[PDB]
């Protein structure tokens, strides 16, 4: 029995669009918290595309700002055309669209997420980590990785650790395989499991060329690496680049705060939230508890604990989780959920005392 | 009470004008190139279409050209759009896996179609309101619109809880006359999958809904992969369809997980029936499989893991040789789902794989 997640680095193509999109946002929210944002980014071969509608009383540069992000991993002026076609403007709340979401969690993890997410997560972070401090040389931001675990026994195997680096031409390959065998092994020992599972190292031969170069990257193609990997449903909403008043993303951090608190406080092993949204409507037009039979009281006294123990408004539940006062990009890369590097609002336990209370304790 | 909510999209909405460009370029390299290797992205930002990413074919190709014969049986002229290309166009044993990445198959049998009730309603609902925009039934509208069919589950029976729809009218409409269509399209929807009448209907909550599709908006290839796949019934592991030819695994394995989650509930093994599939750079085979049945197995799930395996071949070059997939037009797959298409002729829906499941 087999479950693999993927994650990628701040060098890969779609996710330098999700980071450009968010840094739009965050550059917007600085100036302006009422700002209507909804930026995407097609990055193909060396045209770069900023595209999307803004509401704002913000000074921002689209270009400059993607160009910030850019830098960093690091081209430079000579290597990008980058252009707009956004919409810039001036000047309860409802669900400004149709569209379901998932929250979700589970106990397998300290972080309340599937090891095969936090893993593959881990693995790019520290990679990227030793990129910055030169403890790995030779390597450049563009990078995956796969981390494949075998549930069979009661205890979880990894099956495979995969993993692809943008290197040098001119690396030493001992040198780069050592390296990565030696983080592969030190993420495995953190959580603390097997540590004879196969590697496969850039299995792909050379990867040199990276980012958009050969390629291309748009907004929200890594829907399921920004989510669950995907252990969870998903409703087919990409998050960056959109203001809380986009209910696919303020909806979907509001169902991981119910999903992870449920879960802290001991109500259940793994919990799912589904919810859909009206045009108009300021509350979830349809709500949906999934425990996968692992509820420790009954599924019954939690759908009553969720219900009294969270508002379902819009506006009050973006306020709670302070989305207007939040910096997006740091979520742009590595996950949006059980970021225990970060400091969300939807992943803070402060609904556990109340949950406990409210199914009657 | 427990409600599973799924949507649909027009051929007008901006993300599925794009996946419609991406699989039309496709199609147009396949046609005149078995060999063509594709991987075609579009932008629609408000006035401009960019159409990109990587192809590799002997076919004469105008993409640009391809993009206004879909753009222009939705309604707009040579005047409503620039639509420019920064695609990278060229020329030239075993297919190994040329990506990473998870794939799932889902079934259940709660449809003809072997698909999510919600789904198939969401799906069957815009279908049907296109048809009568194309045949002049239904007058003052236009091909951006989206579905949201929310259903109850709770009794033995399900219950349609809400239907929602959401339709580009033009600015001189008749109210009346458009809730009088609609309404009587759900009622009809309902009635041919003999479901309750009484559920709540919402029609164009927003209000005015005249300007659409890429106008004052944005469309990407691939952002209506739950559309495409099972409604949020299914896992998806995070790949779009639209504008990749069948060796890009994200695609072929996605169908061929399908076909073998379809003739499984088809066999009577389960009611429900999902597949993990996992891929590794150069791996011939699916580097890991996962078999789901929801405790909804007729048989050991073990015996069915067995009759899979013997089966079907997992070598991914025989697969999609199998399911004709050089062969295969994907245009009319990028609208309304993937799965599923009783309306269609797809390889990865037929159910020829039964009488080898039962053996096994």
Same mark, same amino acid.
């Given at each position: 029995?087999?479950?693999?997640?993927?994650?990628?680095?701040?060098?890969?193509?779609?996710?330098?669009?999700?980071?450009?999109?968010?840094?739009?946002?965050?550059?917007?929210?600085?100036?302006?918290?009422?700002?209507?944002?909804?930026?995407?980014?097609?990055?193909?071969?060396?045209?770069?595309?900023?595209?999307?509608?803004?509401?704002?009383?913000?000074?921002?540069?689209?270009?400059?700002?993607?160009?910030?992000?850019?830098?960093?991993?690091?081209?430079?002026?000579?290597?990008?055309?980058?252009?707009?076609?956004?919409?810039?403007?001036?000047?309860?709340?409802?669900?400004?669209?149709?569209?379901?979401?998932?929250?979700?969690?589970?106990?397998?993890?300290?972080?309340?997420?599937?090891?095969?997410?936090?893993?593959?997560?881990?693995?790019?972070?520290?990679?990227?980590?030793?990129?910055?401090?030169?403890?790995?040389?030779?390597?450049?931001?563009?990078?995956?990785?796969?981390?494949?675990?075998?549930?069979?026994?009661?205890?979880?195997?990894?099956?495979?650790?995969?993993?692809?680096?943008?290197?040098?031409?001119?690396?030493?390959?001992?040198?780069?395989?050592?390296?990565?065998?030696?983080?592969?092994?030190?993420?495995?020992?953190?959580?603390?499991?097997? !540590?004879?599972?196969?590697?496969? @190292?850039?299995? &792909?031969?050379? %990867?040199? *060329?990276?980012?958009? +170069?050969? /390629?291309?990257? =748009?907004?929200?193609?890594?829907?399921?690496?920004?989510?669950?990997?995907?252990?969870?449903?998903?409703?087919?909403?990409?998050?960056?680049?959109?203001?809380?008043?986009?209910?696919?993303?303020?909806?979907?951090?509001?169902?991981?705060?119910?999903?992870?608190?449920?879960?802290?406080?001991?109500?259940?092993?793994?919990?799912?939230?589904?919810?859909?949204?009206?045009?108009?409507?300021?509350?979830?037009?349809?709500?949906?508890?999934?425990?996968?039979?692992?509820?420790?009281?009954?599924? !019954?006294?939690?759908?009553?604990? @969720?219900?009294? &123990?969270?508002? %379902?408004? *819009?506006?009050?539940? +973006?306020? /709670?989780?302070? =989305?207007?006062?939040?910096?997006?990009?740091?979520?742009?890369?590595?996950?949006?959920?059980?970021?225990?590097?970060?400091?969300?609002?939807?992943?803070?336990?402060?609904?556990?005392?109340?949950?406990?209370?409210?199914?009657?304790?």
């Amino acid at each position: 029995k087999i479950i693999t997640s993927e994650s990628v680095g701040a060098g890969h193509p779609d996710k330098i669009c999700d980071q450009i999109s968010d840094a739009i946002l965050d550059e917007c929210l600085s100036q302006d918290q009422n700002s209507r944002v909804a930026c995407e980014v097609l990055a193909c071969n060396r045209l770069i595309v900023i595209a999307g509608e803004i509401t704002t009383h913000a000074y921002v540069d689209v270009v400059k700002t993607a160009w910030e992000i850019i830098k960093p991993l690091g081209y430079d002026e000579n290597d990008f055309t980058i252009i707009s076609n956004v919409n810039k403007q001036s000047v309860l709340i409802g669900a400004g669209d149709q569209g379901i979401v998932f929250g979700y969690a589970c106990d397998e993890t300290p972080q309340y997420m599937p090891l095969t997410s936090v893993l593959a997560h881990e693995l790019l972070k520290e990679i990227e980590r030793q990129r910055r401090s030169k403890e790995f040389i030779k390597i450049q931001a563009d990078m995956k990785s796969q981390v494949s675990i075998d549930y069979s026994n009661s205890t979880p195997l990894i099956e495979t650790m995969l993993v692809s680096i943008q290197h040098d031409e001119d690396y030493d390959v001992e040198y780069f395989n050592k390296k990565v065998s030696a983080i592969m092994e030190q993420i495995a020992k953190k959580y603390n499991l097997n !540590t004879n599972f196969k590697k496969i @190292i850039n299995s &792909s031969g050379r %990867f040199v *060329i990276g980012g958009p +170069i050969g /390629d291309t990257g =748009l907004t929200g193609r890594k829907i399921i690496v920004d989510t669950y990997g995907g252990v969870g449903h998903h409703g087919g909403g990409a998050f960056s680049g959109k203001d809380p008043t986009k209910v696919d993303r303020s909806a979907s951090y509001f169902a991981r705060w119910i999903a992870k608190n449920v879960v802290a406080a001991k109500l259940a092993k793994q919990c799912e939230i589904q919810l859909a949204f009206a045009i108009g409507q300021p509350q979830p037009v349809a709500m949906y508890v999934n425990t996968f039979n692992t509820n420790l009281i009954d599924e !019954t006294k939690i759908f009553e604990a @969720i219900k009294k &123990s969270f508002n %379902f408004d *819009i506006k009050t539940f +973006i306020n /709670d989780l302070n =989305l207007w006062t939040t910096k997006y990009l740091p979520v742009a890369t590595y996950g949006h959920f059980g970021r225990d590097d970060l400091d969300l609002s939807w992943e803070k336990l402060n609904k556990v005392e109340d949950l406990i209370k409210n199914s009657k304790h």
